[PDB]
Design a protein around this ligand. Structure first.
Ligand SMILES: C[C@@H]1O[C@@H](O[C@@H]2[C@@H](O[C@H]3O[C@H](CO)[C@H](O)[C@H](O)[C@H]3O)[C@@H](O)[C@@H](CO)O[C@H]2O)[C@@H](O)[C@H](O)[C@@H]1O
Length: 572
């Protein structure tokens, strides 16, 4: 009954994936794709991050037969258990999560098929450093006993004080079915008893089906109604492949033809825009794919990891996400019903998303509207999804606009928490600048952002604290020798091994950094020239900000030219 770890706003969780190399396993070697090792990966995690990070083992392409996954996982659990910190010479067992269920655990899809609940119980009992087990991506192969198995995973975790973590997207009603929509109620009943040992996360991989908004809505609503202990999201750069995108901003669609070039191409800073939807809504668990780009290779941090994810995760440790009680205090509408019956992701298009195929929001006015599936009972206006207010786009906005007042101006994403404005440009693959006007009392701030740019603006006693992130390296070289989408489609495959080698050769080193680009901040109602203090950021990535003070009009325009992360304070 005693929890093996805490997971909450004060103790968030960053999952650190390590994917088994099946070819090398057949040869009697225990290795991970990308050349990370269990011990070296752990060692290389900043010490300040170690208490909030857990190694997640994934069996990837281990042989699909009995014993392969048990053998690999036992080897790695042993390595983790006997780890010695050297500095301190002390045995400090590495915390681990095992991937136990994926692709419906079909024997033609995964070695995880041959991991029994009996075996999981035995591992929990043997290894105190085993903190949880992980189910991921089953929406497209929704197996006959998936809900029964999920109950067993939750029960066996609760019995041992560990967590059952499930990452899933609402394609084909997956989240609704999980709780009993179609009559499979084992997991619903398991949750009734064991919700404090459950973590439920979105998995935004299937971007072409547009279920980002509805899945996140459910994750939040499940949390708020005590159907999961905490929630989070797995954010996946394979979304670029799923939607058929190629060179940044280029026109034309290539479909699913260049996988390994495609999962490299999503702007680094855009993962931070995705992750803000988790943070701003009380979520505390974070995970990413493709691991080589989002985390790194060979026990080294990728620039995406170092410049975006690590900065972002440090921010949410230093500023804990809003508590359940706070999020619940702020909630004005809570939806009860099935999004699958109301157009799915279409439900929020032109309400707070700009298109079907996006992991972003276009306004923070309503933040994320929480919901639970209609099969669940309750247990703030609680509104049935079939109520007249939700029948159309315009009905949704009119109803919500009475309960959620307009709190900023401009076509841009922004959301306010206490003294902090959170802002991003919501464009995905269109090179359009956006502007907003935000207020702290009193103080009036305009901003102008290019795409793939987020900022956090905190009113402090002597001014304004600013965190900016627009880190975006140049991926054009991956798309060399292709003048249009037809040509790009026909490029030689980069290949899985080739992409790992590209990261080693041209991303970890010899980086093709993006161009510096302009952000404008305009302060109004200003008496004298503000000063800049505590200026730091990504190495060699920003010019000294330029100020222009218009004394009469009580305004200062600050021009930043940068490509990276950045922070400073303005005193005024
Ligand atoms: C069923 C699902 O399989 C894996 O995700 C795939 C993904 O697989 C490739 O990339 C991953 C790392 O991101 C591994 O290297 C795999 O070996 C690769 O084959 C892609 O094929 C995407 C395309 O959208 O589809 C996903 O299904 C795995 O990462 C998941 O956790 C899950 O087990």
């Amino acid at each position: 009954v005693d929890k093996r770890r805490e997971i909450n706003n004060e103790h968030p969780l960053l999952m650190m994936p390590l994917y088994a190399n099946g070819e090398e396993f057949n040869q009697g070697k225990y290795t991970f794709w990308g050349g990370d090792t269990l011990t070296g990966k752990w060692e290389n995690i900043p010490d300040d991050l170690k208490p909030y990070t857990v190694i997640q083992l994934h069996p990837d392409d281990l042989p699909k037969r009995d014993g392969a996954a048990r053998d690999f996982y036992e080897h790695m659990l042993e390595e983790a258990a006997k780890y010695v910190n050297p500095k301190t010479g002390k045995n400090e067992p590495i915390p681990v999560i095992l991937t136990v269920y994926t692709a419906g655990n079909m024997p033609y899809y995964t070695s995880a098929h041959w991991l029994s609940t009996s075996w999981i119980d035995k591992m929990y009992q043997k290894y105190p450093n085993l903190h949880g087990i992980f189910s991921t991506e089953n929406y497209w192969i929704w197996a006959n006993d998936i809900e029964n198995k999920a109950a067993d995973y939750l029960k066996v975790s609760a019995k041992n004080g560990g967590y059952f973590i499930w990452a899933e997207q609402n394609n084909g009603s997956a989240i609704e079915k999980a709780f009993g929509k179609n009559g499979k109620i084992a997991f619903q009943k398991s949750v009734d008893k064991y919700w404090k040992n459950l973590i439920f996360m979105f998995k935004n991989t299937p971007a072409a089906e547009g279920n980002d908004s509805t899945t996140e809505s459910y994750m939040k609503g499940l949390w708020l109604s005590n159907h999961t202990y905490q929630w989070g999201g797995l954010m996946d750069t394979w979304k670029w492949y799923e939607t058929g995108k190629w060179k940044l901003f280029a026109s034309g669609n290539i479909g699913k033809s260049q996988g390994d070039r495609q999962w490299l191409t999503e702007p680094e800073s855009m993962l931070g825009e995705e992750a803000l939807g988790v943070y701003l809504n009380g979520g505390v668990v974070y995970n990413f794919e493709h691991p080589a780009y989002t985390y790194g290779v060979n026990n080294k941090e990728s620039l995406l990891f170092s410049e975006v994810i690590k900065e972002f995760f440090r921010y949410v440790i230093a500023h804990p996400a809003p508590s359940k009680e706070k999020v619940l205090e702020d909630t004005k509408v809570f939806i009860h019903g099935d999004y699958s019956n109301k157009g799915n992701g279409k439900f929020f298009v032109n309400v707070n998303t700009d298109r079907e195929q996006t992991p972003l929001y276009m306004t923070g006015r309503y933040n994320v509207i929480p919901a639970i599936p209609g099969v669940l009972k309750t247990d703030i206006q609680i509104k049935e999804i079939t109520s007249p207010e939700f029948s159309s786009t315009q009905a949704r906005k009119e109803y919500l606009n009475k309960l959620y007042p307009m709190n900023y101006e401009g076509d841009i994403f922004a959301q306010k928490l206490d003294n902090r404005w959170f802002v991003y440009n919501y464009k995905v693959n269109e090179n359009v600048k956006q502007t907003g006007k935000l207020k702290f009392n009193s103080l009036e701030m305009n901003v102008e952002f290019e795409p793939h740019t987020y900022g956090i603006f905190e009113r402090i006693s002597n001014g304004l604290k600013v965190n900016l992130n627009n880190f975006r390296t140049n991926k054009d070289s991956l798309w060399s020798n292709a003048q249009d989408a037809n040509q790009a489609k026909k490029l030689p495959q980069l290949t899985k091994k080739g992409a790992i080698k590209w990261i080693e050769e041209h991303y970890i080193k010899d980086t093709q950094f993006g161009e510096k680009r302009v952000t404008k901040i305009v302060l109004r109602g200003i008496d004298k020239l503000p000063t800049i203090h505590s200026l730091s950021g990504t190495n060699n990535s920003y010019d000294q900000p330029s100020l222009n003070f218009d004394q009469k009009n009580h305004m200062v325009t600050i021009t930043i030219n940068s490509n990276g992360n950045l922070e400073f304070e303005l005193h005024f």
